[PDB]
Amino acid sequence: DQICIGYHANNSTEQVDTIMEKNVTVTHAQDILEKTHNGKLCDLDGVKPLILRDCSVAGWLLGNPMCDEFINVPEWSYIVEKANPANDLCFPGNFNDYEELKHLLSRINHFEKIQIIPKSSWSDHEASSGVSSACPYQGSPSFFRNVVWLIKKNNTYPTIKRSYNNTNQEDLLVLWGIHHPNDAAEQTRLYQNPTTYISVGTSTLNQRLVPKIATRSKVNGQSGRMEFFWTILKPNDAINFESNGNFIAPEYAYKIVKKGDSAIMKSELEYGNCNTKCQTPIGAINSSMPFHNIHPLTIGECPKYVKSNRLVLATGLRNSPLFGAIAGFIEGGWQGMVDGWYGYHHSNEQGSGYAADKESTQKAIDGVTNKVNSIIDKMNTQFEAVGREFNNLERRIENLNKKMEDGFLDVWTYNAELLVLMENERTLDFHDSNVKNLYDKVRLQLRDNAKELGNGCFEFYHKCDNECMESVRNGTYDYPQYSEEARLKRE
Amino acid sequence: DQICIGYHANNSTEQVDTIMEKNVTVTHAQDILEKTHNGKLCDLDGVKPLILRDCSVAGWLLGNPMCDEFINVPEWSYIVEKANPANDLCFPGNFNDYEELKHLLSRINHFEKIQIIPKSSWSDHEASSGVSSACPYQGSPSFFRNVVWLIKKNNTYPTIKRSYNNTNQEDLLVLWGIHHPNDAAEQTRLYQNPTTYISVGTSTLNQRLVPKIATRSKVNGQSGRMEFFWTILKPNDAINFESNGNFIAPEYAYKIVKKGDSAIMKSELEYGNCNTKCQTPIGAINSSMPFHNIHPLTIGECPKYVKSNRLVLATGLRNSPLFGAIAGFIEGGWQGMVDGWYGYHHSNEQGSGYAADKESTQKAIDGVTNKVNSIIDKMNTQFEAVGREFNNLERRIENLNKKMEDGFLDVWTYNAELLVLMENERTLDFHDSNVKNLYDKVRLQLRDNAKELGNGCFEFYHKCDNECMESVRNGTYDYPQYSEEARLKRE
Amino acid sequence: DQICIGYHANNSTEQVDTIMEKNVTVTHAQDILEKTHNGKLCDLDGVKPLILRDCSVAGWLLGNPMCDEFINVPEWSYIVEKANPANDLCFPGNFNDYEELKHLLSRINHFEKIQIIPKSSWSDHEASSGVSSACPYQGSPSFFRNVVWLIKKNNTYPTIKRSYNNTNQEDLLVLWGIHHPNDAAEQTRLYQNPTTYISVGTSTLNQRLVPKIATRSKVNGQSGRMEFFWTILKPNDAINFESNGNFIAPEYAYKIVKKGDSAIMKSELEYGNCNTKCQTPIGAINSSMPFHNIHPLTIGECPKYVKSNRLVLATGLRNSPLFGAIAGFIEGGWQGMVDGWYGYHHSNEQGSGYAADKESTQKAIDGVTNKVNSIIDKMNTQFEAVGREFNNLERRIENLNKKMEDGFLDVWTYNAELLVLMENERTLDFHDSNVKNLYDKVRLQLRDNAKELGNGCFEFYHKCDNECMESVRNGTYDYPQYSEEARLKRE
Ligand SMILES: *[C@@H]1O[C@H](CO)[C@@H](O[C@@H]2O[C@H](CO)[C@@H](O)[C@H](O)[C@H]2NC(C)=O)[C@H](O)[C@H]1NC(C)=O
Ligand SMILES: *[C@@H]1O[C@H](CO)[C@@H](O[C@@H]2O[C@H](CO)[C@@H](O)[C@H](O)[C@H]2NC(C)=O)[C@H](O)[C@H]1NC(C)=O
Ligand SMILES: *[C@@H]1O[C@H](CO)[C@@H](O[C@@H]2O[C@H](CO)[C@@H](O)[C@H](O)[C@H]2NC(C)=O)[C@H](O)[C@H]1NC(C)=O
Ligand SMILES: *[C@@H]1O[C@H](CO)[C@@H](O[C@@H]2O[C@H](CO)[C@@H](O)[C@H](O)[C@H]2NC(C)=O)[C@H](O)[C@H]1NC(C)=O
Ligand SMILES: *[C@@H]1O[C@H](CO)[C@@H](O[C@@H]2O[C@H](CO)[C@@H](O)[C@H](O)[C@H]2NC(C)=O)[C@H](O)[C@H]1NC(C)=O
Ligand SMILES: *[C@@H]1O[C@H](CO)[C@@H](O[C@@H]2O[C@H](CO)[C@@H](O)[C@H](O)[C@H]2NC(C)=O)[C@H](O)[C@H]1NC(C)=O
Ligand SMILES: *[C@@H]1O[C@H](CO)[C@@H](O)[C@H](O)[C@H]1NC(C)=O
Ligand SMILES: *[C@@H]1O[C@H](CO)[C@@H](O)[C@H](O)[C@H]1NC(C)=O
Ligand SMILES: *[C@@H]1O[C@H](CO)[C@@H](O)[C@H](O)[C@H]1NC(C)=O
Ligand SMILES: *[C@@H]1O[C@H](CO)[C@@H](O)[C@H](O)[C@H]1NC(C)=O
Ligand SMILES: *[C@@H]1O[C@H](CO)[C@@H](O)[C@H](O)[C@H]1NC(C)=O
Ligand SMILES: *[C@@H]1O[C@H](CO)[C@@H](O)[C@H](O)[C@H]1NC(C)=O
Ligand SMILES: *[C@@H]1O[C@H](CO)[C@@H](O)[C@H](O)[C@H]1NC(C)=O
Ligand SMILES: *[C@@H]1O[C@H](CO)[C@@H](O)[C@H](O)[C@H]1NC(C)=O
Ligand SMILES: *[C@@H]1O[C@H](CO)[C@@H](O)[C@H](O)[C@H]1NC(C)=O
Ligand SMILES: [Mg+2]
Ligand SMILES: [Mg+2]
Ligand SMILES: [Mg+2]
Ligand SMILES: [Mg+2]
Ligand SMILES: [Mg+2]
Ligand SMILES: [Mg+2]
Ligand SMILES: [Mg+2]
Ligand SMILES: [Mg+2]
Ligand SMILES: [Mg+2]
Ligand SMILES: [Mg+2]
Ligand SMILES: [Mg+2]
Ligand SMILES: [Mg+2]
C-alpha cells in the first residue's frame, strides 16, 4: 500500500519565458498580446470617418474644385488624410499656421459651413472673374469655392471696408488670403493700384499684409502665389476687413458645432465597410487582450500598445515531457490527474487511482487569477501616442517629439516584458512550493507508519484501505490505530 | 513537556497589498504616502511669496495703475498669479514674447526698479498728456506707470534720438511699446506725422516697428492697440532708441539683482499666514513621507509626487485573526509573544510561557529596515514637473509638454506601486522563511528525543525543565543526556 | 565515516548589493558598468572628425577669412565645435534659423563646395570692394569668402535680376545676406539708392527683405549689421534673386553629397590621434560592458548610458569569511572545493576529501549565465540622448528638452539599478536553494543508516568505503545492504 504526492501534466506545448530559462513548457498559459488586425479603415463606434481620399485638409477647407466631395460634410469620428494627396493648394502658395490648425481639427467632429459674406454683395469689385486654369473645374478654370478672388471693376478698386460679427453662439473658423503677383504689370492689370495692403482686425488680431511682388519659378503653371490665413472668431466678435487690392475674401466660414476629440490619421487605405471600437492607421482591432503590437497611434477603447513580439503569462505549472518538488524529488507529472493541479495517487488491495487535493488547487487558481488581473490593470495607464505634425523649419521640435514618443514606447515595453518574465518565474516557484507543502503535510501525519521512499511516495508499513487513504487526504489520520501493526511490520 | 515554534500576532488592522492578494492584514506596516495639505499659500522658508492678487504679471511689470501694490516689491520666494486676473493690460494690445518672459521670471527672486529715462527729460514732446480712461487711477484717466506715452508738443514731433547705457553691473530688464491707432485722423491728431517708425538697437537687437493703422473692434473702450516689447540689457550695453511717433517710452526699468530660482504658481488662493518648506498651488506640505499625492507642481524640499491613493509597505508579518510555516503547519500567531517577532512557547512541570528568539527577530528587523530605506531612496531622483505656459498658436508644443509631464508622472507612479507590491510579497515570504528555519533548527537538536507533533510543536519523550528548555532555545542541547530516558519512554 | 554537503568559498573580496543587504561578499561577481574613457577626440571607425578648432559653424559656412582650414573639407564622421569659438560672424549680424541648420548638419557627412554665381559675372556692380577691417585676412581687410558684398559701380546700382537653377541631382545649400547700414549717409555712399529691397523666390520661398537703417552700438568695430539667410534648393529648382542694393550675394554653395547621420559635439578638446568605435564629448570608449557612465551624448556602437557609480551583478554565492543552507545550518564554505560550486566532503578509513556535485553546479552556471544575458539584452533599447540647440527666446523649449532628456536618463538608471538589486537577491537565494536541495537528496537516501548531525553532515552508523561514498554522490545507494550493520550499531 502506498500513497504519493504529485501534480498535473497534460499534452500542452504552450511555452513561456523567465529570466533564467527560455522556452519552458507549461500545462497552461495565457497570452495577453493582440497580434492581428483587420487591415481596414472602419466606422468608429458607428460613426464613419471623413476619408478625404485624394484631397488634403487645405484643399478641403478652402474648397479646391477637385474636392467636391466635402462641400458639406457629415459629423466624422476620425479623419484620414493620405501622405502626399494630389488635391492640395491647386494655385501655388502657402497656408499660414497650417499645423496648428490641423491640431485644432484633431479636437473637432463637426463643422457646419455657413455663408458669411455673400458673393453678390460686392457691387463695385468684379467678384466672378477671379479664376485660374491652375484650379480647373470640369475642364474650365475655377478657384477655391469658399473664398472669392476680387479684381478691379471698370479699371477701379475702391478701398474695401467690410465687417462680419459672429452670432450662432458657436465659435467660427474664418479663412482669407492675399495674392502675391508676378510683376507690376499684373499688379495694375488686376487691381490697378500699384501698392496695396490688407488689414485684418479682431479684438485679438491686428495684421497688415502687403503683397510681395516678385518673379518666382512657376509651379502648377502659375508664377504668382496665394498666402492663406485663418482664425477662430469668438461667438460675439467682429472680424473687420479693409483693403485696396490683392484681397482673397471669405465667402463661406465654418461653425465649430461639436468638439468631440478625434485624430487625423495618415494612411493610404480606402474605406473598408466595417464597424469597430479601436482603429489604427493600418487596420482595426477586435480584441479583449490588454496589450497589442499593431501600431502606436490608436483611437477608441484600445489595448495598450507595446513593441513585444510575444507576451505570454505562465498560469499552469512546468509541464513534464527552486523548492524541492516539481521536476525534483518528484520526477514528473501525472497525465492521469485531470480534476486538479496538485493531488495524490494511491495503491492498495482494493483501489488504484488519483485524487486531486482541491482547495489547494483552488488556493492556487485564486492566486494566479489575482496575479493576472493585477498585471492587466497595473498598466491601465500607459503613454498614448498622438500624431503631431511639423513643417520644414520645426525639425528640432519634430525630432524631440519623436524621441519622446519613442522613449515612452520603449519604457512601457520594457516594463511589460520584464514584469511578465519575473512573474512567470515566481509563478512556477509558487507551484513548486504548493507541491512541497502538500508532501510535507502528508509526511508528519505518517511518521514511522510509512517508509519515505524519496520520489514523492510513501510505502505503508501497515495496510491502508480506501478509507484510510481518504483519512490521509482529509488530514485526519489516526496514527495510534496503526502504531502497533506498523511497529510489528518493521522487521 | 513540549516546546513550540511560533510567531508574533497583535490586534492590528493595518492592511497591505501584494500581486496575489489584496487587503492582507499585517502586525506592522509603514505608510509612505502623504495625503493631506494645509490648503494655504505660505511663506517658503520664511521668504514670503509675491501674491499678485488681482494683477497679472504684465499689469505688474508695466505698472497698471490698479496695480499699486507692486510699484516697489520685496524679494519673493515664489509668485502666485490668478487664472484670469482682472488687472492685465488695461489699454488693449499685446505683450511680445510674454511666455518667454514669464519663463525668465521663474528664475528671479528680486527686481530693483530704477528710473533710466526720467519723465522730465522730454523737453520737446509733451510727456504728461498720454493718458486714457481705459486705465483709470482713482476716477481719472491714467496709464502704465513705468512707461510714458509721448504725444506732439505744439503740433510737432521732432524725431527722437535717445540712448541708455547699462551700469550697475547687473542685468537690466527694459520695456517699451508702440501705439497702433484707430485711423489717420488720430495718427496726425496725436503725432502729426502721417507715417512713423521706431528703431530699437542694442548689440544684439535690430528692430524697426511701424504702427499698423486700422479700425478694430474696440475692447475696454479703446479701438487702438498698444504692442509692448521687452529685452534684457547686458551690464555694459546701450539700448539706443530712435522714433518720430507712436513711441511708448521706458521711464523705469528693472535690475535683476538676485536670481534665486523659483516658480509662478496659478492659484485662486489668498495668502495664508504660515511658513512651510514645501508649497503646492493648492496647499502646503508638512511631511517626512518620501511620497505625496497632493499636486504635481511643488517648490521646496518636497516628497516625490505620485498618483497613488494608498502606498503602504509591509514590515511585520501576516497577522492572524510560500514556505511551510506561517498560516501553514503553524496555524496562527501568538498574541502572548510581545518581545519579538519569532520565538518559542514551552510547557513543563514548573513553567509555561513565551520566549522570543531575539537575534533572529533582530536579523529580521535589520533586513526590513534596510529594505525600506532602499525603497525611500532608490527613487530619490524622480521627475519634477514645472509650470510652462504657451499661447494660442503653441497648442502643439503645449500638448507635447502635457503628454510629457504626464507620461513621467504615470511611469513613476507605476514604479512606486509595483515596487511596493513586489516587496510586500517578498517581505511576507521572508517572515515565513525565518519561522521555518527556526523550526528546522529546533528539530535536528531533538531528533528522536521528541515526537514532532505537526503544528509547530515538539512533545518531549523525556522530561525537560526550564534549563533544558533554555538549552534548546540556546542551541546547546545535549542529546545523549536524555537518549536513555527517552528511548525507555518509547513504549 | 561521514559525508557532508557544502559549497564553494574562495578569497574573493568582490562585493554586491541587494535590497536588504549592502556590501555582501560573493565568490564571483560580474561588473557590467564601464567607468573609464581615454579622454580624447578620435577618428570614429577610421573616419576623422571635422574639428572646427576656433571657428564656429557659421564662420565655417560663410567662410570667415580666419577660417581658412575649412575652405574645402573632407567627409567627416562627427563635428566638434567649441563653446564660445572666437571666429564666428566677424562682421556683426545674425544668422537666420541657425539652429535648424545645425540640426540639418547633424545628418550630413559630406559637403562639396561649388561656385554657382561667379565673382566676375557682376559687370555693373563693383564686386571686389565689399571689404571690412572687422574681417581681416593677414593684416588687411577682407570678407566672408563664399559670399560677395556688392557696392555701387560709378555712382549707380542697377536693379539686379539673377537666377540659378539646380543641377547635380543633389540637394544644394545656398546662403545669402542683407546689409543693415548705420545711416542714410552710408546707405547712399554704398548703394546710392535711398531705399532698397531683396526679393528671394524659389518654388517654396517668397521673401522681401528691406534694410533696417538705424544707429546701433558698434561691436567688433562696426555699427552696421549683416543678416544672413540660407535655404536648401531641390535638385531641379531655381533660386531667382532680385535687388537694388544692400545685397550680399552667393558666390559658393554646398552640395549635400552624402547624408550619413552624425552629431555636433561641444568640446574644448583638440584632436587626439586615435581610432575608436564609440566617442563622447569628453573622451572615447573601448568597452564590452553593456552600460557606461561616461557621458549622455555618444556616437557609434556604444554601451547604454546610466547614471550609476557601481553596477555589479552577483554570479557566485555568498562568500564565507532564505532557504536553510548557506550561512545557515551549514555555517561556512569550503575553501578546499575548487572544481564546482556545490558538492560533498567525505571521511572514512581510506580517504578524506572533496567532490563537487557537477551537473548541479552546471545547472547553476547555466541559470546564472542566462540571467546575465537577459539583463544585458532586456535593456537593448534605452533612450539615446541627442544634442539640440536653442536660442535665447526658445528657453521654454530648451528647458522642456532638458527635463525630457534627463527624465529618461533617470528612469533607465533606476531600472538598471533596481533590476540588479532584485536579481542579486534572487541569485543568492538560488544558491541557497541548490545547496538545500542537494542536502535533501542525500538525506532520503540514508535514512536511519546515518545520524543527521545538523551541520550539513551525516555520521554513518555503518562503515562506508570510497565506493559506498561514490554511490551516495551518484544517487545509487543501496539501503538494504547496510540495513543490518547499521541497525546493530544503533546501541
Ligand atoms: C456685434 O458685436 C457687438 C459687440 O461689439 C454686440 O453688441 C451687443 O448687442 C446686443 C443687442 O443685439 C446688446 O444687448 C449688447 O448691449 C451689445 N453689447 C455691447 C458691448 O455693446 C452685438 O450683439 C453683435 N451683433 C451681431 C449681429 O453679431
Ligand atoms: C475525513 O475523511 C474521513 C473518511 O475518509 C471521514 O470520516 C469518517 O470515517 C469514519 C471511520 O473512519 C466513518 O465511520 C465515517 O462514515 C466517515 N464519515 C464520512 C462523512 O465520510 C470524514 O467525514 C472526513 N471529514 C470531512 C469534513 O469530510
Ligand atoms: C557705455 O558702453 C561703453 C561701451 O560702448 C563703455 O565704454 C567703456 O568705458 C570705460 C570708462 O568709463 C573705459 O574704461 C572703456 O575703455 C570703455 N570700453 C570701450 C569698448 O570703449 C562705457 O563704460 C559705458 N558707459 C556707461 C555710462 O554705461
Ligand atoms: C546556553 O543555555 C544554558 C542554560 O539555559 C547556559 O548553560 C549553563 O547550564 C549549566 C547546566 O546546564 C549551568 O550549570 C550553568 O549555570 C548555565 N550557565 C549560565 C550562564 O546560564 C549557557 O550559559 C547558555 N549559553 C550562553 C552564551 O548564554
Ligand atoms: C531648370 O529648371 C527647369 C524647370 O523649371 C528644368 O526644365 C526641364 O529641362 C529639361 C531639359 O533640360 C526638359 O527635359 C524638361 O521638359 C524641363 N522640365 C520643365 C517643367 O520644363 C531645367 O532642366 C532646369 N535647367 C537647369 C540648367 O538646371
Ligand atoms: C554509480 O556509482 C557507482 C560507483 O561509485 C558505479 O557502480 C558500480 O559499483 C559496482 C559495485 O558497487 C562496481 O562493481 C562497478 O565497477 C561500479 N561501476 C563503475 C563504472 O564504476 C556506477 O557505475 C555509477 N553510475 C554511473 C552512471 O557512473
Ligand atoms: C525556442 O528556441 C528559440 C529561443 O530559445 C527560438 O528560436 C524558438 O522559436 C523557440 N521555439 C519555437 C517553437 O519557435
Ligand atoms: C466705366 O465703365 C463705363 C461703362 O460701364 C464707361 O463709360 C467708363 O468709361 C468706364 N471708366 C473707365 C476709367 O474706363
Ligand atoms: C468582434 O468582437 C465583437 C464584440 O465586441 C463582436 O462583434 C464579434 O463577435 C467579434 N468578431 C469575431 C470574428 O469574432
Ligand atoms: C478591502 O476590499 C476592497 C479591495 O479588495 C476595498 O473596496 C476595500 O476598501 C478594502 N478595505 C477597506 C477597509 O476599505
Ligand atoms: C507753437 O507754440 C507757440 C506758443 O507756445 C505759438 O506761438 C506757435 O504758433 C505754435 N506753433 C504752431 C505751428 O502752432
Ligand atoms: C510641522 O513639521 C515641522 C518640522 O519641520 C514642525 O514645525 C511642526 O512640529 C509640524 N506641525 C505639526 C502640527 O505637527
Ligand atoms: C561598504 O560600506 C559603505 C556602504 O555600506 C561604503 O561607504 C563602502 O565604500 C563600502 N565598501 C568599500 C570597500 O568601499
Ligand atoms: C561713370 O564713369 C565714367 C568714367 O568711367 C565717367 O565718365 C562718368 O562721369 C561716370 N558717371 C557719374 C554719374 O559719375
Ligand atoms: C580596445 O578594444 C579593441 C577591440 O575592438 C582593441 O583594438 C584593443 O585590443 C583594445 N585596447 C586595449 C588597451 O585593450
Ligand atoms: Mg506528480
Ligand atoms: Mg507537469
Ligand atoms: Mg488624402
Ligand atoms: Mg518520497
Ligand atoms: Mg505562532
Ligand atoms: Mg500573526
Ligand atoms: Mg493674480
Ligand atoms: Mg510540529
Ligand atoms: Mg560548505
Ligand atoms: Mg562561500
Ligand atoms: Mg570651435
Ligand atoms: Mg546535518
PDB file of N, CA, C and O in Angstrom, chain C residues 208-219:
ATOM      1  N   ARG C 208      10.768  89.118 -49.064  1.00  0.00           N
ATOM      2  CA  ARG C 208      11.083  90.512 -49.359  1.00  0.00           C
ATOM      3  C   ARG C 208      11.812  91.081 -48.145  1.00  0.00           C
ATOM      4  O   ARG C 208      11.171  91.467 -47.163  1.00  0.00           O
ATOM      5  N   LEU C 209      13.140  91.128 -48.199  1.00  0.00           N
ATOM      6  CA  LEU C 209      13.922  91.777 -47.153  1.00  0.00           C
ATOM      7  C   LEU C 209      14.117  93.260 -47.473  1.00  0.00           C
ATOM      8  O   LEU C 209      14.165  93.671 -48.640  1.00  0.00           O
ATOM      9  N   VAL C 210      14.240  94.058 -46.416  1.00  0.00           N
ATOM     10  CA  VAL C 210      14.400  95.504 -46.535  1.00  0.00           C
ATOM     11  C   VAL C 210      15.333  95.983 -45.428  1.00  0.00           C
ATOM     12  O   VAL C 210      15.070  95.731 -44.239  1.00  0.00           O
ATOM     13  N   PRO C 211      16.425  96.667 -45.766  1.00  0.00           N
ATOM     14  CA  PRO C 211      17.427  97.004 -44.748  1.00  0.00           C
ATOM     15  C   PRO C 211      16.846  97.910 -43.676  1.00  0.00           C
ATOM     16  O   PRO C 211      16.248  98.946 -43.967  1.00  0.00           O
ATOM     17  N   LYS C 212      17.002  97.500 -42.424  1.00  0.00           N
ATOM     18  CA  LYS C 212      16.651  98.380 -41.320  1.00  0.00           C
ATOM     19  C   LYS C 212      17.838  99.308 -41.094  1.00  0.00           C
ATOM     20  O   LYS C 212      18.878  98.884 -40.574  1.00  0.00           O
ATOM     21  N   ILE C 213      17.696 100.565 -41.520  1.00  0.00           N
ATOM     22  CA  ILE C 213      18.736 101.576 -41.351  1.00  0.00           C
ATOM     23  C   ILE C 213      18.540 102.203 -39.973  1.00  0.00           C
ATOM     24  O   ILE C 213      17.502 102.809 -39.696  1.00  0.00           O
ATOM     25  N   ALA C 214      19.525 102.017 -39.094  1.00  0.00           N
ATOM     26  CA  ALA C 214      19.449 102.548 -37.741  1.00  0.00           C
ATOM     27  C   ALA C 214      20.847 102.589 -37.145  1.00  0.00           C
ATOM     28  O   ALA C 214      21.729 101.820 -37.538  1.00  0.00           O
ATOM     29  N   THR C 215      21.043 103.516 -36.211  1.00  0.00           N
ATOM     30  CA  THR C 215      22.294 103.603 -35.474  1.00  0.00           C
ATOM     31  C   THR C 215      22.270 102.594 -34.331  1.00  0.00           C
ATOM     32  O   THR C 215      21.281 102.501 -33.593  1.00  0.00           O
ATOM     33  N   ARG C 216      23.358 101.831 -34.201  1.00  0.00           N
ATOM     34  CA  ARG C 216      23.465 100.724 -33.260  1.00  0.00           C
ATOM     35  C   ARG C 216      24.819 100.742 -32.567  1.00  0.00           C
ATOM     36  O   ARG C 216      25.835 101.084 -33.180  1.00  0.00           O
ATOM     37  N   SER C 217      24.826 100.368 -31.287  1.00  0.00           N
ATOM     38  CA  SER C 217      26.071 100.203 -30.537  1.00  0.00           C
ATOM     39  C   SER C 217      27.018  99.272 -31.284  1.00  0.00           C
ATOM     40  O   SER C 217      26.701  98.101 -31.501  1.00  0.00           O
ATOM     41  N   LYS C 218      28.171  99.798 -31.692  1.00  0.00           N
ATOM     42  CA  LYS C 218      29.063  99.054 -32.571  1.00  0.00           C
ATOM     43  C   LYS C 218      29.831  98.000 -31.789  1.00  0.00           C
ATOM     44  O   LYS C 218      30.338  98.255 -30.691  1.00  0.00           O
ATOM     45  N   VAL C 219      29.868  96.800 -32.343  1.00  0.00           N
ATOM     46  CA  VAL C 219      30.655  95.700 -31.813  1.00  0.00           C
ATOM     47  C   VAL C 219      31.618  95.268 -32.909  1.00  0.00           C
ATOM     48  O   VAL C 219      31.304  95.357 -34.099  1.00  0.00           O
TER      49      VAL C 219
END
